[PDB]
Design a protein around this ligand. Structure first.
Ligand code: MG
Ligand code: MG
Ligand code: MG
Ligand code: MG
Ligand code: MG
Ligand code: MG
Ligand code: MG
Ligand code: MG
Ligand code: MG
Ligand code: MG
Ligand code: MG
Ligand code: MG
Ligand code: MG
Ligand code: MG
Ligand code: MG
Ligand code: MG
Ligand code: MG
Ligand code: MG
Ligand code: MG
Ligand code: MG
Ligand code: MG
Ligand code: MG
Ligand code: MG
Ligand code: MG
Ligand code: MG
Ligand code: MG
Ligand code: MG
Ligand code: MG
Ligand code: MG
Ligand code: MG
Ligand code: MG
Ligand code: MG
Ligand code: MG
Ligand code: MG
Ligand code: MG
Ligand code: MG
Ligand code: MG
Ligand code: MG
Ligand code: MG
Ligand code: MG
Ligand code: MG
Ligand code: MG
Ligand code: MG
Ligand code: MG
Ligand code: MG
Ligand code: MG
Ligand code: MG
Ligand code: MG
Ligand code: MG
Ligand code: MG
Ligand code: MG
Ligand code: MG
Ligand code: MG
Lengths: 85, 98, 44, 181, 136
RNA sequence: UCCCCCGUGCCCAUAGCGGCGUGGAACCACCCGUUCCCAUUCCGAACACGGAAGUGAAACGCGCCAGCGCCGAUGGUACUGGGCGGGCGACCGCCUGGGAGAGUAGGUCGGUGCGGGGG
RNA sequence: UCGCCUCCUAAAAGGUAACGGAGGCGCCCAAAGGUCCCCUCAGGCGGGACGGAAAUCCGCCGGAGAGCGCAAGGGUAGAAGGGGGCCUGACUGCGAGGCCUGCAAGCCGAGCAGGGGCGAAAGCCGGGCCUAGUGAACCGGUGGUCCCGUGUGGAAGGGCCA
RNA sequence: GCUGACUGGGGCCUGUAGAGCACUGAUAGGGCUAGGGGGCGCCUACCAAACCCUGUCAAACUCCGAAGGGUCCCA
RNA sequence: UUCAUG
RNA sequence: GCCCGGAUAGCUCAGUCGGUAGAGCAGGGGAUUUUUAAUCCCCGUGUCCUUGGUUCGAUUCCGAGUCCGGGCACCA
RNA sequence: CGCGGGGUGGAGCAGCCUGGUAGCUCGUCGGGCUCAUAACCCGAAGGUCGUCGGUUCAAAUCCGGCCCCCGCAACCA
C-alpha cells in the first residue's frame, strides 16, 4: 500500500557560496605591484614591508619583488615582498 | 603604560627618534629595514645649560647639520611619547619640512 | 531616504543616503563637483 | 596655598614620627598622601526635568574643584538608567587642594556626623587606601540647609603610598583621623 | 545539556585516547571492541551491579553519553531524525575502561562486572588493579 | 679592547610572572613648583614647562632563585601518504616510507645588533 | 525551500553535495565615516553613604576570556574598543596589477592629476574591523549636457552624464 | 617548442587525522565551600557556582597538530 | 411603580 | 507619483469671510439620589501643527516643511 | 504522522508592539442593604503571564524548540 505516513520540514539547507580565501602568492613567488597576496577575512597575515593591506585585509604587493614571510611570534605573521634588482 | 607606539606607524625610512629626558634630550636618525643608527645628538653633553626649549632647538640645529654632514634630506619624526610641543625641533637643514 | 546633494542652484547631484528622522534638513556637505571645484551642496 | 596647616603638621611632625616609629630607611619610604577622591552615585535621571547638577556645584564649592560627570559603564535595567550617559560625580584632589580639603574635613567636618563614635578601622584591608562614606553631605563648613533640595551623601577615598594597611593606619591617625576602638 | 546537538555518526576508528587505564576504584570493566554504549545500557549495567552486590560500594561510570543518537520515526528522508530515541550514547572505543567498582571484594566484583558486560554489547576484559601510575 | 648607563631595533616567553639584593659619580626616574607653553568631560595624577634643593623609596637597570610559567629532546606509540591482506560486520593486521600530541629527562630568568655618554 | 552571509559536513590548498547540522540579512550610521591626539577592557579580590549579588569611586591581579550596531566565524588593545578637537575622501577623472569566474558579476587596488580634509611633518582619507544588507536587462521618470536634431533656424523627442 | 602528468631538492601555506583541555561547551569521583531544603538562631549529605586533585568527550572547542595535499623556483 | 425567596 | 481636505481641549469638529477664541462628548465638583443611568447647575484638560512672512494686532491670509485622512494613477 | 493556533487573576478572556507602561467580566474577601438569603452598592486584593534556553541592559512581548489543548490535512494507487 505504501502508506506514506510522514513528512518533515527541513530547516537547515542554506550555505553561502565560499569565498576562495587564503594566501595566493607563497614564499618565493615573483609578484608584481598590485598582485594580491593574501585573501583573508581577519588579518591573520599582517602586512609588512612594501605590502599594503586592503579594505578587507587583502594583502597585496606594492612593488615588483619576491615574497617572503616571517612569523614574528607574539607580533604576527608578516608577509613582505622583498624587492629584486 | 605609555604603550603609545607612534613608533610602528612609521614605515617610511630615516626615523628621527627623540628622547625627552628630565635632564637632556637625545635625538637619533635610525634607518629602517636594517636597523642601524646613523647620526645622533645629545643636548647637555653637547652644549648649553639646562634652558631646555632653546637647547632643544640647538640640539636640532646640530643634528640637522650632522645629517647634512652626510647628505640626508628626507626623514620622519618619531618618539611616540612626544606630544609635539616645547620639546622643539623646529629646524632648518632637514627637508622633512618639520 | 536616498537624497542627492545639489551644487547650490546648480548641477552635480552627489547622491548620499540620509537617515531622515535622525538629522537631515539642509544637509550641508562640502563636496567636489564635476565643474567649478568645491562648494556647499545642500541636499535634493 | 602652599602652607596648608595640615600639610605643615605632616611635614613637621608626622614623617619623623613615623620614622621614629617604624624604623624607616628612606624619606620616600614613609607613607605620603596622593589622592582624595569623592564619589557621588546619584542615580537620578527621570522625567519632569530632573537636572540635578546643582550637586556638582555643591561639591565644587565644598572642595574647591569642579567635579566631572562620569557616564555609567555598564547599563543595567534594575535601576532604570541605561545607555551610558546620565550621572555619576567624581572629583580627585591631589596636592595642596587635597590638603586644604582634609583641613576642612578632619577638623571641621567630622567633628559633625550626627552621632560619630568614630571611623571604621577595618576599612583599609591590604592596600593603602582608606575609604569612608558620608551619610549626610552637609556636615561640611560651607553648606547648610538653605542651599540644597535633598541629601547628597558622598563617599571619599584617600589613597596613601603605603604598601600595607598598618602603615596607612599610622599615617592617617596622626594626620588627624579618629577611629573606633 | 548545552551547545547545539544532533551530531553526526563520526566513525569508531583507532583507539588511543580511547583507552588508557583504570584510575578510580579497584576493578574495572574494559571494552575490547568499539561500540556505541547507550545511556540505557549504562543504566542497565549499573543497576545490574548495584543490585547484585546490594547496598555495596562505588561503581564509577567513567563513560558518559554525550552524543545524540538519532532515529527517524519509520518514514522516508527529509532532514535529520527527531533525535534521542532512547537518548544519548557514549562513543566507546576499545581499551576504554567503562566501569570501575571500588573496595568490594573480588568475588562480588568478578560476578558483578561480568553481569555488566553481559548487559553491555561489547566483549570485555575485566582488570584487577595496579595499572598505569605516575607518582614518585 | 672590556665591563657601566642611556636610547633604539632583531629573534619573539629558553628571555614572562613572582621572589630574593643591588644601583645613584654620572646617566634615567621619582621629585620642587605651575609664573612660562600646553594641560586634564575633575586633578601639572597623565600630558607640558621651569628647576635642580633631596632620594633610589617606588619605577627601571643589573645580578642570584625555579615557585608558577615557557621551551622541551632521545625513545616509543598514535596517525598516515604508498602497497598487500584479514573482517558478513563494527573494523583490524603486515610491509614500506614519514611521524606527532601529551608525557618524561631536562633546558631556561636572556641572546644580540646600531649610535651616543662615562672609568 | 528558492537570493545573499557565517560556521560545520569539506577528507590541514581551493572548490565540493543532500529535503544534512546551526544561525542570520533584505538594513543601519552625518558620526557607528576621515584625520589628529589621548585612554584601556571584561572579570575576580578587597574597601566604600542611599548604593542589586555587577550602578558610580579607589587600589591590586588582571593579555585578551570585554568591546567592535546586528547572526556567525576570522581578527583585534603595538586598535579595529572608548573619549576629545577639526572636518567631509559616503570626492571628480582614471587606474598598472591581480584575486575570482563558464560568461555576466563580485572583490582588493598602489599610483597620477584636479581639488580639498586632518596633521608640525612623515603620512593617512575614493565610507564604515571584514565577509551579508540586494537586482542584469528593457521601458520610463527627474536634473544637467560643449551631442543629434528628418530641407534650413528651433522645438518635439532622442542620446550622453547623474 | 621542453613547458606538461610524475618525481627529486628547496621554500612557504593549512588546522583534517591524531591528541589535549590553553579556550566554547558537556563531563565522572573525592575535598573545599557562595544562594534555596531539614525547626532555622550561627546551623544539616558534592540535595548545590568558583576553586581544588584525580578522570574524561566533542563536526560546529583548539595551547599543539603530522602523513599529506596545493603553489612557486632549480632540475 | 420598581424588587426574587424563606 | 500627483491632486484634494485637515492639523482648534482627553476625543470629534464650527469659525465674525482679521477687532471676540467655541460647542458636543469625556473628566471633576455640586442637587435629588433603593440600584446604575437619565436629568439639572458650574468649572477644563487649550501656544488654535511648526516656523518664516503680509497686516496695526493672525486659527483665519500667503508660501515652505512636517505629520495627517482619502482620491486616482502607473508600477519598469 | 506533518503543518498553524493558542496558552495571561479561581474560571472565561482582552492583551502585552520591539520589548521597560498587565488588565476586563463574573467569581473572592471585608463592609453597606435585608428580619435573613438573593440581587444591588462601596473598599481593595489576587497571576512563576505554558515550562524551558536564546540575542538582549531588560522578556509576558521577539527567536527557537518541548508538554497539554484546539483547528487542519493524512490524497492518487
Ligand atoms: Mg584602504
Ligand atoms: Mg620610537
Ligand atoms: Mg524613493
Ligand atoms: Mg628577550
Ligand atoms: Mg620568591
Ligand atoms: Mg640592597
Ligand atoms: Mg648624583
Ligand atoms: Mg622611564
Ligand atoms: Mg627600588
Ligand atoms: Mg611536549
Ligand atoms: Mg614529541
Ligand atoms: Mg627563570
Ligand atoms: Mg636567559
Ligand atoms: Mg579548506
Ligand atoms: Mg570606527
Ligand atoms: Mg567596597
Ligand atoms: Mg560603594
Ligand atoms: Mg574584545
Ligand atoms: Mg542585522
Ligand atoms: Mg575577526
Ligand atoms: Mg575625535
Ligand atoms: Mg569574469
Ligand atoms: Mg565588477
Ligand atoms: Mg557576495
Ligand atoms: Mg558593515
Ligand atoms: Mg523584455
Ligand atoms: Mg523630410
Ligand atoms: Mg529640420
Ligand atoms: Mg562620469
Ligand atoms: Mg579527532
Ligand atoms: Mg573543558
Ligand atoms: Mg573555542
Ligand atoms: Mg608541511
Ligand atoms: Mg585538501
Ligand atoms: Mg625540465
Ligand atoms: Mg424602577
Ligand atoms: Mg425583580
Ligand atoms: Mg428557592
Ligand atoms: Mg415554614
Ligand atoms: Mg482639531
Ligand atoms: Mg487633540
Ligand atoms: Mg473651516
Ligand atoms: Mg445627551
Ligand atoms: Mg449624558
Ligand atoms: Mg468652559
Ligand atoms: Mg491658553
Ligand atoms: Mg495663525
Ligand atoms: Mg502672523
Ligand atoms: Mg504601485
Ligand atoms: Mg490580571
Ligand atoms: Mg485559565
Ligand atoms: Mg461579596
Ligand atoms: Mg482514491
Amino acid at each position: 500500500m505504501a502508506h506514506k505516513k510522514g513528512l518533515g520540514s527541513t530547516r537547515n539547507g542554506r550555505d553561502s557560496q565560499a569565498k576562495r580565501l587564503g594566501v595566493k602568492r607563497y614564499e618565493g613567488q615573483v609578484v608584481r605591484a598590485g598582485n594580491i597576496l593574501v585573501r583573508q577575512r581577519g588579518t591573520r597575515f599582517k602586512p609588512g614591508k612594501n605590502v599594503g593591506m586592503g579594505r578587507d585585509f587583502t594583502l597585496f604587493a606594492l612593488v615588483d619583488g619576491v615574497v617572503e614571510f616571517q612569523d614574528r611570534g607574539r607580533l604576527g605573521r608578516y608577509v613582505h615582498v622583498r624587492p629584486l634588482a | 603604560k605609555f604603550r603609545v607606539r607612534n613608533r610602528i606607524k612609521r614605515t617610511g625610512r630615516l626615523r628621527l627618534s627623540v628622547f625627552r629626558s628630565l635632564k637632556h634630550i637625545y635625538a637619533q636618525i635610525i634607518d629602517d629595514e636594517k636597523g642601524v643608527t646613523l647620526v645622533s645628538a645629545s643636548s647637555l653633553a653637547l652644549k648649553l645649560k639646562g634652558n631646555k626649549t632653546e637647547v632643544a632647538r640647538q640640539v636640532g640645529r646640530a643634528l640637522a647639520e650632522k645629517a647634512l654632514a652626510l647628505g640626508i634630506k628626507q626623514v620622519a619624526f618619531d618618539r611616540g611619547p612626544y606630544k609635539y610641543h616645547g620639546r622643539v625641533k623646529a629646524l632648518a637643514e632637514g627637508a622633512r619640512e618639520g | 531616504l536616498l537624497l542627492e546633494c545639489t551644487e547650490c542652484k546648480r548641477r552635480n547631484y552627489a547622491t548620499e543616503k540620509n537617515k531622515r528622522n535622525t538629522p537631515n534638513k539642509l544637509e550641508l556637505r562640502k563636496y567636489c563637483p564635476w565643474c567649478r571645484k568645491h562648494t556647499v551642496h545642500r541636499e535634493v | 596655598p602652599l602652607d596648608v596647616a595640615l600639610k605643615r603638621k605632616y611635614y613637621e611632625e608626622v614623617r619623623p614620627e613615623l620614622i621614629r616609629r617604624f624604623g624607616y630607611q628612606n624619606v620616600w619610604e614613609v607613607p605620603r598622601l596622593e589622592k582624595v577622591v569623592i564619589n557621588q552615585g546619584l542615580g537620578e535621571a527621570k522625567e519632569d526635568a530632573r537636572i540635578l547638577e546643582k550637586a556638582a556645584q555643591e561639591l565644587a564649592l565644598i572642595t574647591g574643584q569642579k567635579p566631572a560627570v562620569t557616564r555609567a559603564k555598564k547599563s543595567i535595567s534594575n535601576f532604570k538608567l541605561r545607555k551610558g550617559m546620565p550621572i555619576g560625580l567624581r572629583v580627585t584632589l591631589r596636592r595642596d587642594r587635597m590638603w586644604i580639603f582634609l583641613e576642612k574635613l578632619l577638623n571641621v567636618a567630622l567633628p559633625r556626623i550626627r552621632d560619630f563614635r568614630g571611623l571604621n578601622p577595618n576599612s583599609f584591608d591590604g592596600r593603602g587606601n582608606y575609604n569612608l562614606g558620608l551619610r549626610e553631605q552637609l556636615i561640611f563648613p560651607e553648606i547648610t540647609y538653605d542651599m540644597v533640595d535633598a541629601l547628597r551623601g558622598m563617599d571619599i577615598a584617600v589613597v596613601t603610598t603605603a604598601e600595607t594597611d598598618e602603615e596607612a593606619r599610622a599615617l592617617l591617625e596622626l594626620l588627624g583621623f579618629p577611629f573606633r576602638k | 545539556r548545552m551547545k547545539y546537538r544532533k551530531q553526526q555518526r563520526g566513525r569508531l576508528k583507532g583507539a588511543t585516547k580511547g583507552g588508557d587505564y583504570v584510575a578510580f576504584g579497584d576493578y574495572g570493566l574494559v571494552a575490547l571492541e568499539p561500540a556505541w554504549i547507550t545511556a540505557q545500557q549504562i543504566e542497565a549495567a549499573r543497576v545490574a551491579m548495584v543490585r547484585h552486590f546490594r547496598r555495596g560500594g562505588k561503581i564509577f561510570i567513567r563513560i558518559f553519553p554525550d552524543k545524540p543518537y538519532t532515529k527517524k520515526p519509520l518514514e522516508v528522508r527529509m532532514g535529520k531524525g527527531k533525535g534521542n530515541v532512547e537518548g544519548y550514547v557514549a562513543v566507546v572505543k576499545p581499551g576504554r575502561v567503562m566501569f570501575e567498582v571500588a573496595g568490594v571484594t573480588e568475588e562480588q566484583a568478578m560476578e558483578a562486572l561480568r553481569i555488566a558486560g553481559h548487559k553491555l554489547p561489547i566483549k570485555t576484559k575485566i582488570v584487577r588493579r595496579d595499572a598505569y601510575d605516575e607518582a614518585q
